[PDB]
Design a binder for this molecule. Sequence first.
Ligand SMILES: CCCCCCCCCCCCCCCCCC(=O)OC[C@H](COP(=O)(O)OC[C@H](N)C(=O)O)OC(=O)CCCCCCCCCCCCCCCCC
Ligand SMILES: CCCCCCCCCCCCCCCCCC(=O)OC[C@H](COP(=O)(O)OC[C@H](N)C(=O)O)OC(=O)CCCCCCCCCCCCCCCCC
Ligand SMILES: CCCCCCCCCCCCCCCCCC(=O)OC[C@H](COP(=O)(O)OC[C@H](N)C(=O)O)OC(=O)CCCCCCCCCCCCCCCCC
Ligand SMILES: CCCCCCCCCCCCCCCCCC(=O)OC[C@H](COP(=O)(O)OC[C@H](N)C(=O)O)OC(=O)CCCCCCCCCCCCCCCCC
Ligand SMILES: COc1ccc(Cl)cc1C(=O)NCCc1ccc(S(=O)(=O)NC(=O)NC2CCCCC2)cc1
Ligand SMILES: Nc1ncnc2c1ncn2[C@@H]1O[C@H](COP(=O)(O)OP(=O)(O)OP(=O)(O)O)[C@@H](O)[C@H]1O
Ligand SMILES: Nc1ncnc2c1ncn2[C@@H]1O[C@H](COP(=O)(O)OP(=O)(O)OP(=O)(O)O)[C@@H](O)[C@H]1O
Ligand SMILES: *[C@@H]1O[C@H](CO)[C@@H](O)[C@H](O)[C@H]1NC(C)=O
Lengths: 620, 4, 99, 168, 328, 167
Amino acid sequence: MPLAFCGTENHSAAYRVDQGVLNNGCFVDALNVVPHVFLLFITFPILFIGWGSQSSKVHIHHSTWLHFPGHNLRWILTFILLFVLVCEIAEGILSDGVTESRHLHLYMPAGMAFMAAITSVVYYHNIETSNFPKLLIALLIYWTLAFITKTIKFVKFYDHAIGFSQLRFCLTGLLVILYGMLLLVEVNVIRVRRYIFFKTPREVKPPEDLQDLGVRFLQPFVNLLSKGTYWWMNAFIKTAHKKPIDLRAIAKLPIAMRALTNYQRLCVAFDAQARKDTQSPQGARAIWRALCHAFGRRLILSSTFRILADLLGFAGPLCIFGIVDHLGKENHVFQPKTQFLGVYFVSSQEFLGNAYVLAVLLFLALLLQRTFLQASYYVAIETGINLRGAIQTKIYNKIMMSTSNLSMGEMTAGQICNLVAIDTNQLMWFFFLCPNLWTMPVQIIVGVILLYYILGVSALIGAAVIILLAPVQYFVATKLSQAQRTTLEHSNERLKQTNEMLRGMKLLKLYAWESIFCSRVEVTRRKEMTSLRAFAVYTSISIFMNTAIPIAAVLITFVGHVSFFKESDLSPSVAFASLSLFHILVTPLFLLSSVVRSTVKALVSVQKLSEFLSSAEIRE
Amino acid sequence: LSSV
Amino acid sequence: DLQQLDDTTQLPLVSHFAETVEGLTTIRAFRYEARFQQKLLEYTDSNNIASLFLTAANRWLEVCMEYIGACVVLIAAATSISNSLHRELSAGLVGLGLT
Amino acid sequence: MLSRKGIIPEEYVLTRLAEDPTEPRYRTRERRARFVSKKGNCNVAHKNIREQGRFLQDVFTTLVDLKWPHTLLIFTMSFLCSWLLFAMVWWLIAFAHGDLAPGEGTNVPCVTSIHSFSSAFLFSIEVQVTIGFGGRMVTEECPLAILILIVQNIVGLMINAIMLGCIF
Amino acid sequence: RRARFVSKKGNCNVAHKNIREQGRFLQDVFTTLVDLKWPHTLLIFTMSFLCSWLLFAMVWWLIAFAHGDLAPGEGTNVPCVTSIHSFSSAFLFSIEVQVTIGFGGRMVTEECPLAILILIVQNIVGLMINAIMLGCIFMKTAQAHRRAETLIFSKHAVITLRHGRLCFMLRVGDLRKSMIISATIHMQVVRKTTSPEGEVVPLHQVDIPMENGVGGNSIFLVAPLIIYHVIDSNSPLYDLAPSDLHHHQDLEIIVILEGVVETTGITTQARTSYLADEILWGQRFVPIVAEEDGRYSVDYSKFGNTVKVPTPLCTARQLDEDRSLLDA
Amino acid sequence: MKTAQAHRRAETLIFSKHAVITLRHGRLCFMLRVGDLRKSMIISATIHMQVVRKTTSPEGEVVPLHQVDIPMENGVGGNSIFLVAPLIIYHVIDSNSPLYDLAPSDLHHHQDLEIIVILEGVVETTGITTQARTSYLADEILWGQRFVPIVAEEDGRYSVDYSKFGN
Ligand SMILES: CCCCCCCCCCCCCCCCCC(=O)OC[C@H](COP(=O)(O)OC[C@H](N)C(=O)O)OC(=O)CCCCCCCCCCCCCCCCC
Ligand SMILES: CCCCCCCCCCCCCCCCCC(=O)OC[C@H](COP(=O)(O)OC[C@H](N)C(=O)O)OC(=O)CCCCCCCCCCCCCCCCC
Ligand SMILES: CCCCCCCCCCCCCCCCCC(=O)OC[C@H](COP(=O)(O)OC[C@H](N)C(=O)O)OC(=O)CCCCCCCCCCCCCCCCC
Ligand SMILES: CCCCCCCCCCCCCCCCCC(=O)OC[C@H](COP(=O)(O)OC[C@H](N)C(=O)O)OC(=O)CCCCCCCCCCCCCCCCC
Ligand SMILES: COc1ccc(Cl)cc1C(=O)NCCc1ccc(S(=O)(=O)NC(=O)NC2CCCCC2)cc1
Ligand SMILES: Nc1ncnc2c1ncn2[C@@H]1O[C@H](COP(=O)(O)OP(=O)(O)OP(=O)(O)O)[C@@H](O)[C@H]1O
Ligand SMILES: Nc1ncnc2c1ncn2[C@@H]1O[C@H](COP(=O)(O)OP(=O)(O)OP(=O)(O)O)[C@@H](O)[C@H]1O
Ligand SMILES: *[C@@H]1O[C@H](CO)[C@@H](O)[C@H](O)[C@H]1NC(C)=O
């Protein structure tokens, strides 16, 4: 009873090739093993040579990166085929359970394919760090070879009347499409860089921004997966432990984020709009359209990541519901009904109903969310920071203005400096919280929808309690900001008085007038202390609300469902899926008030900036 | 150094 | 270090704006505006690069800390389901752990 | 979340002013950059080198340059990858030819005494290292086995020749 | 159009016509094999082995047929080679013997001494062929012509006054970290020079001094170096005029960087040329070797970038007179 | 060590059968043409030159084969040479050269002159140093002749006509 590739039932009758060499359902799996192990045994010597070269003599310490055409879509196809290969492994482990011994022909090909995909992106990266695309022939034959072999497997399944009921048919069909859509990528590289069958290769030089000697913020010129997890930051962070961070140790920022480059882009938007449209002034709405047209191509991308991250965030409570539902019912059967040619096919419903499989899927879903959410954050921040540079340059351009008593007597240099600092910072902070207004409504809507499905009308009562904490937080935060305004505009006078009564220390000390002026300052300090007491009250209500809205909602939720409703008796699956949903919904509900305030202040800031940017100029 |  | 680099980089920039307004007649008199334009761009670049490094470092921590959290989820989920298939945790403590 | 969203407002009335720099001494930080170390080891870090594959095209200069432990790894992996690759081929041709299923007395297997993948892997060891323990022959039943035998012998001799040259 | 003596990346570009062949291009088979491309060497590698295997396979098959051991199938006879049933078995027996596998199922009995003689011949032939192919492979793994391609010569060369003397400069730099021992730099001026006596030499290669500190040709090359030649009365570039430096000019400054690669020990040449159009007048090279925190830093991005600089717009001969007269 | 032999490659180096003596730049120089047949280069190709004579010193010595060295008249004074096309290897007869008393009449067959020529260098295909030796008896020297230009200009590149190599 040893480890056999096709099992050991019916006296090894699974190995008979009498009817057909390629009609033996275990032989097609054996064929699919070949292209993956072929890549491993042709690339491992190459990879170890590369690793040795890095160790013994890493001559190109700052080697430039040349990314081949079709490089972002290359990585995303690898990511989604890694997903399906994990699912194939899960199906194989789940189907072999109903046999006398482990079959090994359900999850050996998928396991070696999983390792082959990982090694085929490591090999591709090592052939992208140093521009040498002739070694990519090994990858083109590999992809097409795999596409051939499982195509044979796919057509055999359709002959034997498998259909879309069996999960592995769907997985194999989808995976075959993946291999075709990535073989096309490889031939795209052939077509562009013209290295294999064309007369003269069309070489490309690395972008000039990376060619600059001092550029440490090399975020754009990085492979997609190190953009997700910020792997390039590791070396920089390690260096910061030994040597400090000097202003000459920080990078010279790339061309894409230069102030003048963003200023030129913003000027292009302004000029194109003001020419194609007969709107004579460049007023508030003109600037609003200009910002959208100039930075929309990145703002939309951030929103897409945020929406995907939100939809994947709701896969934690839902998977918990599935896991704990399966975890009861005494596990009476746990058997695969479908039988085909002595092998069992786990149905789709039988797949997402298991516990270990759902837990592995939950882990993978979290890996996507935690990275999409951070990727969405970075795109929003980078667009906001580029906005700050362009807007600051634009403001300073109009400063180059007439010094009339009408203009200079209305907005003094203090006003314009405050305009620069305050308005642009809170306009930038609007572009940070900008994907929220597109996503957070979807988050709340979809959260309430699927929370109703899990529990019922009592969940809507609890959702009402939480959704009744955005207006409460809004009023408290407005009161908090008003109290802070009063306290801060009072300490300004105190600080000016203290500076005035401490600059002349010698004069006051000589006349024995040090303590008297100290008490004159302490009086204003006591007044500011009363104001700060109001500020402390209004900030303690916010701490209370933040840390007691979810708990009060939970109490109302469950008490209503048991006492008032009595519809369905509580279960651990329902009662913890709903509780987990409450945490994931409390996080954005509180911050929604700050998003609204930021949007309001953004409108007022652009009103300020448009009353300035269209003032009286100097001359022609 | 002293900074470290 | 990056936090201080942020603050101490945006201090000269706002200061520069104030100074430029006061001697605006003097600057336009010398026809020497391009030098102060380059001063703005140099100050703006020095501020944006510090701000971007602070952002990227913050995102670096968040990604790494969330992967550790995700690894916790996988370890907790696997072991808890195992214990509840054999040792009979009764399916309540399992959910109280996963949440 | 101390300042996750509440850091948007700016006072712009801060009292921050000039402060002592307390910069570290430049003499301690600055150290004479030696062109070459006391014993060779030229300390001249290169930068911005454009890579056109020149460093990986001359694989034999690279192989000799590498340290012995890395050469041992490449030595071992080259042999073991070829051994495993041809083991897969030998196992799969046997399982395709249907000779490890029947056990029938009249059928003549194309590779005698193939019963599993361990036997196929041992047969791959014997062919490429040229040991030939005799218990796993090649019969005349399928000409594909003869072609694979030719390919395996030629590949093994090429690999041995290249590794001999690198070692010398 | 214009004929290149050598290409920019070495590759001597001279077509040799009307050579009488005495068979030399095949008389020394081993140098020819090493010159061959790797795919072609593999073809001959495979063909040599396979032809030997198949030739001796025919011999073993034919001796078995003559000895009457494969036709009858009667166990009373004792075959000279065990279990030779067909030509496929004979071919497999050749594989076993010459590669020295010996699958045991096809032994050699004592019955016919011709088999023993053929066994001796086959083993000796297999060992000779293995020895010869090993030698060719070892001289093909010690090739250092791919290392020569990591020696970088700047695309354009400039001329600027150094120490008051108008010198023709040049930058050469190394990419690999491993040194090149005994790096020697030669330099020539391929020109069509006519002597007063009526001689007309088509390509009169004239050597060039390298203005070394000891007058020699040796150089210690780690970082990119400026290789300047001082144009004096004894140099063939002493009558160069900037208007005589366009494309259709009969100039070519060949450069030969010899040296032995330390990783293997094989002497290598790196070759380049510089047509008159690729000569730039009155410029200089931007400095490269900075000084970073710990050690030196060489920026290869600016390897060939050049900046202009004021220069006399006259020949070198007219410059010795512009200074002698002032001194006088 | 027998597959790395490079004597059969040295057999592809070609020396003109007879050398000439002809004026260049007024001075009288001993010219010689050396050519290569293979497409591969010879790295560090060095050329020596010696005059084997029977020398009687004033003190009474009689050396039967006294090998006096000879300058190659290179642009830098060295011996190294770069050889793709056929080169002219000319030695200028100055007051210090032992050929400073040659005559057309004294250059017949029964004259005790021989001009050894030692071409060296390291082949690139193997990395083995080689030699290419030849000699020129006093009958195989032709006074007052010049070699024919050989490196004609082809459309694409430079074409060398080896047919007129010795003309
Ligand atoms: C039609 C006749 C011509 C036949 C050949 C034409 C080209 C074939 C293309 C398909 C080859 C398959 C994928 C291999 C990928 C590498 C191929 C290759 O050429 O290597 C690329 C590199 C080096 O290239 P380069 O010198 O910069 O440029 C090539 C040059 N310009 C030229 O003349 O090209 O190479 C290297 O730097 C070598 C690194 C190590 C190589 C290790 C490869 C192991 C192969 C083992 C094969 C096992 C087969 C077993 C069969 C069993 C089944 C029965
Ligand atoms: C339900 C959907 C999920 C399906 C699962 C598989 C994974 C996701 C696949 C689906 C979408 C993938 C991304 C596509 C979005 C299109 C754009 C894209 O690829 O990059 C989007 C952005 C920016 O890109 P850019 O244009 O190069 O930006 C700079 C530009 N060059 C410039 O000049 O300015 O890029 C960035 O801003 C950097 C971050 C990119 C996102 C992170 C990449 C994936 C990391 C995840 C790691 C673990 C995932 C698990 C994989 C294995 C699972 C077993
Ligand atoms: C007194 C007169 C002189 C001596 C006469 C010898 C009489 C020999 C009779 C039997 C000959 C067998 C046929 C072999 C084919 C070639 C034979 C042969 O002699 O080739 C001739 C040449 C060898 O140089 P050379 O030109 O003679 O040199 C003379 C002088 N130095 C010169 O400059 O000219 O060859 C070459 O220049 C080599 C070219 C390629 C060689 C490739 C190897 C061929 C065999 C490969 C074997 C294949 C596998 C089968 C093995 C089976 C063995 C039983
Ligand atoms: C029995 C079936 C055949 C079995 C084959 C055995 C395969 C075993 C693994 C491979 C062993 C050999 C790998 C050697 C790789 C050497 C790499 C290397 O030296 O630099 C990269 C090479 C070198 O450039 P080149 O211009 O082509 O040649 C050098 C130059 N011309 C010279 O003078 O030196 O540039 C290159 O391009 C890379 C070298 C070639 C890459 C891979 C070689 C195989 C290609 C496929 C050809 C197979 C032909 C067999 C057909 C047989 C038909 C009967
Ligand atoms: C913690 O976020 C959220 C969590 C949940 C939700 Cl539903 C929304 C958000 C949110 O607010 N999304 C807006 C995008 C965002 C906001 C804050 C942060 S951050 O973590 O505060 N990082 C920094 O501010 N870096 C600064 C940027 C300004 C210059 C100096 C460095 C990062 C990204
Ligand atoms: N950073 C570098 N790394 C490696 N080789 C380089 C680098 N920079 C230039 N070279 C090589 O130097 C030669 C040209 O150098 P140069 O900088 O003078 O010209 P270029 O304009 O950069 O040339 P090209 O466009 O051909 O690369 C070419 O052989 C080129 O491959
Ligand atoms: N086209 C050529 N190809 C190869 N070798 C040549 C060629 N022309 C001359 N040689 C070689 O040069 C030498 C003689 O050159 P030269 O032309 O001066 O004399 P020759 O009278 O043509 O010689 P011969 O007729 O004896 O070969 C001989 O070694 C000869 O083999
Ligand atoms: C294989 O085994 C099962 C269970 O013993 C049996 O039902 C099936 O018919 C067998 N297949 C055969 C005998 O072909």
